[PDB]
Design an enzyme around this catalytic site. Structure first.
Site, PDB file in Angstrom:
ATOM      1  N   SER A  44       0.801  -1.215   0.000  1.00 23.54           N
ATOM      2  CA  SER A  44       0.000   0.000   0.000  1.00 23.54           C
ATOM      3  C   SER A  44       0.835   1.267   0.000  1.00 23.54           C
ATOM      4  O   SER A  44       0.304   2.372   0.144  1.00 23.54           O
ATOM      5  CB  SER A  44      -0.923  -0.009   1.221  1.00 23.54           C
ATOM      6  OG  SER A  44      -1.686   1.178   1.309  1.00 23.54           O
TER       7      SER A  44
ATOM      8  N   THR B  30      -1.785   2.832   4.396  1.00 26.76           N
ATOM      9  CA  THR B  30      -0.956   3.952   3.941  1.00 26.76           C
ATOM     10  C   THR B  30      -0.144   4.396   5.148  1.00 26.76           C
ATOM     11  O   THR B  30      -0.628   4.297   6.272  1.00 26.76           O
ATOM     12  CB  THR B  30      -1.828   5.151   3.509  1.00 26.76           C
ATOM     13  OG1 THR B  30      -2.472   4.855   2.265  1.00 26.76           O
ATOM     14  CG2 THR B  30      -0.979   6.411   3.373  1.00 26.76           C
TER      15      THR B  30
ATOM     16  N   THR C  15       1.634   6.923  -0.099  1.00 21.88           N
ATOM     17  CA  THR C  15       0.740   5.800  -0.375  1.00 21.88           C
ATOM     18  C   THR C  15       0.755   5.400  -1.845  1.00 21.88           C
ATOM     19  O   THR C  15       1.264   6.126  -2.693  1.00 21.88           O
ATOM     20  CB  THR C  15      -0.716   6.186  -0.038  1.00 21.88           C
ATOM     21  OG1 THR C  15      -1.584   5.067  -0.247  1.00 21.88           O
ATOM     22  CG2 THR C  15      -1.180   7.330  -0.952  1.00 21.88           C
TER      23      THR C  15
ATOM     24  N   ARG D 292      -6.760   8.435 -10.211  1.00 22.70           N
ATOM     25  CA  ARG D 292      -7.413   8.751  -8.940  1.00 22.70           C
ATOM     26  C   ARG D 292      -6.368   9.184  -7.913  1.00 22.70           C
ATOM     27  O   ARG D 292      -5.307   8.566  -7.781  1.00 22.70           O
ATOM     28  CB  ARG D 292      -8.189   7.533  -8.420  1.00 22.70           C
ATOM     29  CG  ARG D 292      -8.797   7.693  -7.022  1.00 22.70           C
ATOM     30  CD  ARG D 292      -7.760   7.493  -5.906  1.00 22.70           C
ATOM     31  NE  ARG D 292      -8.393   7.419  -4.582  1.00 22.70           N
ATOM     32  CZ  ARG D 292      -7.748   7.136  -3.451  1.00 22.70           C
ATOM     33  NH1 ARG D 292      -6.442   6.898  -3.464  1.00 22.70           N
ATOM     34  NH2 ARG D 292      -8.416   7.076  -2.306  1.00 22.70           N
TER      35      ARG D 292
ATOM     36  N   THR E  54      -5.003   8.272   7.477  1.00 19.77           N
ATOM     37  CA  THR E  54      -4.899   7.034   6.727  1.00 19.77           C
ATOM     38  C   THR E  54      -6.313   6.492   6.547  1.00 19.77           C
ATOM     39  O   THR E  54      -7.230   6.918   7.246  1.00 19.77           O
ATOM     40  CB  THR E  54      -4.002   6.002   7.472  1.00 19.77           C
ATOM     41  OG1 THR E  54      -3.757   4.887   6.610  1.00 19.77           O
ATOM     42  CG2 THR E  54      -4.680   5.496   8.749  1.00 19.77           C
ATOM     43  N   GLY E  55      -6.502   5.585   5.591  1.00 19.30           N
ATOM     44  CA  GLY E  55      -7.826   5.020   5.366  1.00 19.30           C
ATOM     45  C   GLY E  55      -8.459   5.428   4.046  1.00 19.30           C
ATOM     46  O   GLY E  55      -7.745   5.630   3.053  1.00 19.30           O
TER      47      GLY E  55
END
Lengths: 295, 295
Positions: free
Chosen positions: A50, A152, A170, A180, A203-204
């Protein structure tokens, strides 16, 4: 009482990333150098799918990376959707120190990276290529963020001089649409640092952090007097509210914020359980678990 | 007493952009449709050299546009460094409504635009090409933000239903490095809308607005009880403080904002004088001048 130097990073791999950052911080080095070195460790790791090398590609098989860095005096650097460079955090730092701009994306970011001596390399590992072609069978885009997915790395540190700096890098959501970009390379979203207040990184699910300008909110809440933990908590709750207002289901969303203020106090909060962050100070390095909203 | 509908837009051309937005707003239309229609007018105009068609290219002769849109319910869409599409604000809206993402950049943004039926067009006017080749003889990069230079258009409106929405579209700094992204497509930088609080959009050197997450700050200040005018000013004041901290000369940096709250009250402020914005409500459409810090 000021707990410094101190470094926090997102997820379990933040533990050994912290070890690298501490090599700089423990020697009285700059926070900026510490966070860069710290996250570069993960960028270099082919097994960390990631971040940087080995990162899962977009749905077209392209590994595009996003990263941004911010030092203790509002200097910022960012690269987004950049390919073939294993260390986007370092190109980001070059954007910050060597150009009149703060953000470069795509071909332009790569061209700049190459002009700065970075080496073009193939970031799509055999494993990532294999998994990608396999995913193509049904092309079902369903980004999951958990202990074992889309981790990330965001890292923030307060050095011996009492200066803050942060870095976020990331490979983005696996099988994302070509081009994206998430929150990781956006100042105020994936990362924000104000030396007179504190720093925060996220993060997420990036879309949700961008939507709420997450880290700027966390730092502004700390500016308003919230403890780092409380600042993170409220930012998570703001996302929870918005997710609800948008008619979405919170179970499909995971976001974690970690924060640090000028006194070295720190905190974190996330939407769903299972998120940990690593914290390293003069007492040692430890894996900690913040509270979560989805109960 | 809430004053609605009402629309504000940056610079002189905002007056014409406002007329188009009013065609929607005065009929009880959605703020989202009003702002998209409003800025598209500028994107379409080749005489408007800092937005879409006719926009000055980057130093490589490429016209790359940035834009983002945000509606009344935390929905957002953004495109950055996209070429060949005259209406990036509409592609941004498509990113918002048609994808699981909120930001697409470079080739990926163009590919998505084409998949949505947008037409590939040559955005480099004969005039821009000429000026560019002429600029190449010197290649001295020095961005200026005045009434006839780098006039990006940002628009925010409150519709008959009391809903807020905003749109920001630009061609970015003329002769920027290829891939350079400004504040215009960044949520919280060039634009931010919170339907429970207000909306704000920026003007000035993109790098500086990104650095301070300008519009999120303005809206957050309004959230803390400040009026739109105060928020734009207190934001600018905090920013002036930051510019000084960075050892930069204020005369070289222009950062301003226009804001609107849920009650239809509006405000604007800038570091330097010379900026103007268009305001259209039941009193009609007019150009007003904000207060400024640099006396």
């Amino acid at each position: 009482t000021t707990n410094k130097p101190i470094v926090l990073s997102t997820w379990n791999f933040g533990l050994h990333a912290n070890v690298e950052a501490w090599k700089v911080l423990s020697k009285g080095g700059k926070a900026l150098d510490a966070v860069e070195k710290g996250v570069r460790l993960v960028e270099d790791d082919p097994t960390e799918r990631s971040v940087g090398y080995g990162g899962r590609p977009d749905r077209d098989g392209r590994v595009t990376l996003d990263a941004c860095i911010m030092d203790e005096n509002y200097n910022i650097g960012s690269v987004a959707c950049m390919e073939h460079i294993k260390n986007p955090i370092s190109v980001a730092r070059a954007v910050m120190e060597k150009t009149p701009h703060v953000m470069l994306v795509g071909d332009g970011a790569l061209e700049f990276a190459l002009s700065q001596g970075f080496k073009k390399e193939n970031l799509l590992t055999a494993e990532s290529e294999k998994e990608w072609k396999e995913w193509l069978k049904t092309s079902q885009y369903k980004p999951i963020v958990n202990i074992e997915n889309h981790n990330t790395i965001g890292m923030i540190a307060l050095d011996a001089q009492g200066n803050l700096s942060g870095a976020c890098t990331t490979s983005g959501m696996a099988y994302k649409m070509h081009g994206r970009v998430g929150d990781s390379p956006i100042i105020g979203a994936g990362l924000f640092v104000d030396n007179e207040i504190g720093a925060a990184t996220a993060t997420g699910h990036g879309e949700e952090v961008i939507r709420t300008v997450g880290t700027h909110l966390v730092v502004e809440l700390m500016n308003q007097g919230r403890t780092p933990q409380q600042a993170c908590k409220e930012a998570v709750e703001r996302i929870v509210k918005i997710v609800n207002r948008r008619g979405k289901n919170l179970k499909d969303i995971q976001v974690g914020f970690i924060a640090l203020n000028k006194k070295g106090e720190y905190g974190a909060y996330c939407i769903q359980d299972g998120f940990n962050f690593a914290v390293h100070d003069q007492k040692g390095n430890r894996l900690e678990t913040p509270g979560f909203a989805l109960k």
